[model samples]
Target: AVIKEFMRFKVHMEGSMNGHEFEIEGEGEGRPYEGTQTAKLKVTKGGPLPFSWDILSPQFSRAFTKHPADIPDYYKQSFPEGFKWERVMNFEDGGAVTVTQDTSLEDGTLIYKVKLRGTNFPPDGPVMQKKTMGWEASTERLYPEDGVLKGDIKHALRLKDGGRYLADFKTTYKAKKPVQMPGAYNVDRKLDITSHNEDYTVVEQYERSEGRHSTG
Candidate 1:
């Protein structure tokens, strides 16, 4: 049996925006397989500034290969409970992030906690900064009757500014049938996010897999 699999792929995308209607299409092909994905949005009046913004981002295929036991650990013992790390993400635009995480026992169960310090990200001429952001999340592995493994996740994001922006989200991942063209196994993914604060309330959902796709 093969112990490792290596692959490379390229993706092409095109999109445009005109007031209320916006659309984009993209496709990927390479080493083990080929596939296409697409998304669009339309508004009844005015414009879809924030709603359309997420769909307009450039799409690209990234190479990822790793076994379940080979993944890196998210928490390191060398770092203290409140330890933090700062790193520059975008050299061209001077973007960076300061992040830290802690693990604690809650009701005799282990829980993961994350905190993000306030920082300015002025990359690409847009000044976006979060005064503070935090979250507590839990993850579980599940095996279905079909013998396929799945991941169940529950998380929440808390912004401790301007009366607090809080978001509760759930995500799930399960295996799908192998791709028809390339015979590569696929994972079905779903995410549901809801948030509300002093300024605004929002709900977003997404799901994707072979032969099916949608986003909001």
Candidate 2:
């Protein structure tokens, strides 16, 4: 496996009005994954689910699925309330996130709380995801829901077998006042992933300086 799941954040700070003068010196594990097999978080119980951008990022996914054996299987048909997972993830673009989940009661019975604090990202503004798999498999700007976009993978078998857990979604935000930094223009933006029907009480959380975008 390529252990180098890391890179420097390009100028995601679209404050391009000033052009390419500023370069990103901030590096991390936030490299948008590239490959025919995109990253995913799955339990043997529920099986194959929609390719939603859940809480587990490609970077994190690499870690979680690294040792498939470590992923617990819910052969019992349902996960107990006390089940939980705690993970610390590093992004390719120097972005870092701490993922937490308590299957019990907390913000609607089942919602994972993620904190992207260890900053070092350049506002991955809008983004699009592609797997070379075709349509229903891609994102526009790519979806803008690009960077901090996290999904509700917990919905994994919680719903009926016929339930479609695809929250084909929305999330957009920008800096009110783009701050100028040493090597570039700094923009601290925000993103949220919300689901109304298919799942939430659906996955809804905020990604602020949890990780910030500044330059070298």
Candidate 3:
């Protein structure tokens, strides 16, 4: 099996809404694949809020292993059988989120689902405006292409006052030619968001990324 090892990337966003313009920047890192690989995202907002936050998944992180076979137990500790994660997010706006992520793997299909509810959130907080959110995301190992991967994702939010929104996308990943760094290999990524709600949309149709990976 092809091992990913480590990778990192920076992302920026530009969009407009109700004639109001905005921009955002963020970064993420993929940990080395020892037994369970971990990944985390830290995002900072610009303009009025001038704040930042983190999205985390401790159990899921512990289940993300380098080898497929190594996933069974950890995955069980999380998903379909029974699941629990008190908090998946902590924000600068005095907002936090508690979630339950369930997983199912059977007959060669691996499915992951996530549900979120606001906690200790201010009424004016962005996510607090929505009482809950649901996410359906998947990941598949590509055959015929060593270490390649692909998946589809969807996220839907329901406002406390009844407004509804969703974002859907698919992403593909491929191993690239090794770069000049030790234990490094370039990786190419393509992401396309089919559509989204006006207020929450990224405003970008397709995004392409390329980067080199190494032990961090």
Candidate 4:
């Protein structure tokens, strides 16, 4: 096989400065809605084998305390029921990412190279993650939380474990503001995948759109 599926992407949006511009408030099916996105790939082990993914985004809130409450020793303590976040989906902070490597022998031309920073939070919710929880409990106090200056993925397509050789990955970032009203906060993500044995799950979503860097 050639590792059929394991692709995901996300992007969310909100507004402020200048008032409004960002659009695409929602999108998720194969996954891609910003909380940091870019994983448009194609694998066809011809059939399938072991592969999975899970993407979710579009949220911006603060002060969280569930699980019977009391899980805070530090981290700028401040959580005792403060709801009014019409929108402000927070993931605790973390940024800096990059990737690249593209080639083609035809048959299934693959091309991807992505380098990103920040955006992707929760105990685990963004396609079989490996290092989260804010890099060991908030790195030092939100570490690189919600990146903003680093993104690249010139090309991709070279990952085979049971099919041959070549499979390397170096990972994990977002900004913008807009949420209607009520201290408006915005974040809308939902990515999923379930391979290996297969049952259900293969969703994608993306949001966030504002321009003025060139307006291609």
Q: Candidate 2's residue-wise lDDT over 1-216, tens digit each?
A: 222233221111101110111111111123212211121122222112222233233212111111122222121112123233344433233433443432222322222222222233334311111111111222212111222222222111112223322222221221122222111112222223322234212222222211112233
Flag the better candidate by TM-score, 2 or 3.
Answer: 3
Per-residue error for 133 in candidate 2, Å, reads 14
TM-score of 4: 0.19
Comparing 2 and 4 by TM-score, which wins? 2
Worst 10 residues of 1 by lDDT: 82-91
Where does candidate 3 clash, by residue pair?
79-103
Q: What TM-score would every model get versus the actual structure?
A: 0.25, 0.24, 0.29, 0.19
Candidate 1 per-residue lDDT over residues 1-216, each given as its tens digit: 011132222222222222223222222222211222222222222223322122222122112211123222122111122112221112123433232323332332222223222233342222233332333232223223332223232323334453332222222221223211211122333222223233222212222222111121
Model with the higher TM-score, candidate 1 or 2? 1
| Per-candidate RMSD, Å | 19.3, 20.4, 16.8, 19.2
lDDT of each: 0.25, 0.23, 0.32, 0.20
lDDT sort, best first: 3, 1, 2, 4
User: How close to the true structure is residue 184 of candidate 3, measured as C-alpha lDDT?
Assistant: 22
Error of 3 at 56 (Å): 15
Error of 1 at 61 (Å): 8.9
Q: lDDT by residue for model 3 over 1-216, one digit each (tens)?
A: 121355333334332222223454433334324332222222233343221111222212222334333222222233323222222334444544444444333332233344444345455554433343322232222221233333333334334456544433233322232211112232233333333334432222222333333234
lDDT of 1: 0.25
Q: Write the per-residue lDDT of candidate 4 for residues 26-139, one digit (tens) a residue.
A: 222221111223222222221121111211121211111111122221111211211111212222122111212111112322222221122333224221232211111110
